[PDB]
């Protein structure tokens, strides 16, 4: 898997976004655009801000 850890809380600003809590581990799918990744958290697929996370070593 490719994964990241949430560094800062993020309240979704839009309906297609994930809510982020510090220390959440997200399974990364792809980059939609600079700054914005899709991934899965607690069985939801959504978009999240990439500068709120730290990518982890693959493995």
């Amino acid at each position: 898997k490719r994964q990241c850890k949430v560094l800062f809380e993020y309240i979704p600003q839009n309906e297609d976004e994930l809510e982020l809590k510090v220390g959440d581990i997200i399974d990364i799918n792809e980059e939609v655009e600079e700054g914005w990744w899709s991934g899965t958290l607690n069985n939801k697929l959504g978009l999240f801000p990439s500068n709120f996370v730290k990518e982890l070593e693959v493995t």
């Binding site: 560094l7 809380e9 600003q13 655009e33 600079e34 700054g35 914005w36 500068n51 709120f52 730290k54």
Partner: peptide, 14 residues
């Protein structure tokens, strides 16, 4: 990269 708790502008919706 430095992570900072400011989200980038979005252009692609979904």
């Amino acid at each position: 990269p430095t992570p900072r708790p400011v989200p980038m502008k979005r252009h692609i919706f979904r």
